[PDB]
Amino acid sequence: GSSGSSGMMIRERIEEKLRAAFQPVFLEVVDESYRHNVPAGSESHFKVVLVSDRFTGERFLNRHRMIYSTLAEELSTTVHALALHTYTIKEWEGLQDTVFASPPCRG
């Protein structure tokens, strides 16, 4: 991006970082803008998708510790809670659809 015209959108800052942060295979963030006029200061719906092998059924918390570390403060700035969705290559290969693959075993 040529200098000059730029923005301060969190959604971008988040990904833009992860890109080089881990350099996974998949990346997609779901940001939600203001919907109602009234002031809302209770919760901030936010979700992020990042597929990586590193999440090979290692841990449930370790999935956040790694992410947070990157956007430790970056996110803490305005965002507080986030629903991380770390998946694996396989699981992704057939998240919804599932093929009946049950090969026989050997001695």
Q: How many CB atoms lie within 10 A of CB 18?
A: 19
Residue 42, in any domain of the structure: yes
3-class secondary structure per residue, 81-94? CCEEEEECHHHHHC
Residue 106, in any domain of the structure: no
Our count of domains for the chain comes to: 1
What percent of the chain is helix, strand and coil (3-state, nearest 5)?
A: 30, 15, 55
Given a contact cutoff of 8 angstroms between Cβ atoms, the answer to whether 79 and 10 are in contact is: yes
Residue 3, in any domain of the structure: no
Q: For residue 92, give the CATH number of its domain.
A: 3.30.300.90
Residue 26, in any domain of the structure: yes
Indicate the pairing of strand 28-31 with strand 83-87.
unpaired
Residue 65, in any domain of the structure: yes
Which residues are paired to 86 by β-bridges? 50
Residue 81, in any domain of the structure: yes
Given a contact cutoff of 8 angstroms between Cβ atoms, the answer to whether 67 and 84 are in contact is: yes
Q: How far apart are CA 84 and CA 67, in angstroms?
A: 8
The residue range of the domain holding 92 is: 8-97
Is residue 29 packed enough to be buried (19+ CB in 10 Å), middle (13-18) or exposed (0-12)? middle
Residue 104, in any domain of the structure: no
